[PDB]
Amino acid sequence: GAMGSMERASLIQKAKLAEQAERYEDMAAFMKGAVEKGEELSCEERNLLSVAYKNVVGGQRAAWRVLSSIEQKSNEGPEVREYREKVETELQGVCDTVLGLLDSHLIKEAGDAESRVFYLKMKGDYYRYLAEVATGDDKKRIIDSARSAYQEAMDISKKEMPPTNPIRLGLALNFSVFHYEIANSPEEAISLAKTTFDEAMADLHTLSEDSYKDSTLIMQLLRDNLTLWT
């Protein structure tokens, strides 16, 4: 694509520079180019890809929510709706781009639990972002696509990873947010976050000081949601 003439290692190096410069659109374009080189991604490289697009779509989601709120207040000219639609279309395009990378061909080449769960969690997340703005005939199919990706990731993580694994914990965190915010299943959300937290607590004794810090950090996010939800 646009990055076809740059070396893979240079794209990775520039993605790291872009992160330091808080240039997340550049970071995402560099990591998209790195993926399209066709080689599998290392653990660090998967994190760079995820951080880049999470930041980009995070800004789009925040803008979309501001404009949707203004739009709803007005419905109590066409410009607010038109501009919300513009931002919404741009967000959908980014989500489709990420889902395209996972489908061509990150997921099918990911055989290790850590990589496969990571990519399937991503797939659930970006379908969840599509679901946040969906209204029409595909809202249910988009929701089920998120659910299916999260569920496959959960099944693998429960079989292949310890209960304190940060990716396993963050997957459960986001799947619980999916249940609460998207699927209208707050009891499922609360149950998942509680069981995830409790099983991680019982496994903390196996960890080094650094792994303990990594796991307890995500466990606090589960606790924060439980405090909000109960």
Binding site: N55, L173, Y180, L221, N225
Partner: peptide, 9 residues
């Protein structure tokens, strides 16, 4: 409800 912040790495 907070998801993974995942904005820094």
């Amino acid at each position: 409800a907070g998801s993974i912040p995942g904005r820094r790495s």
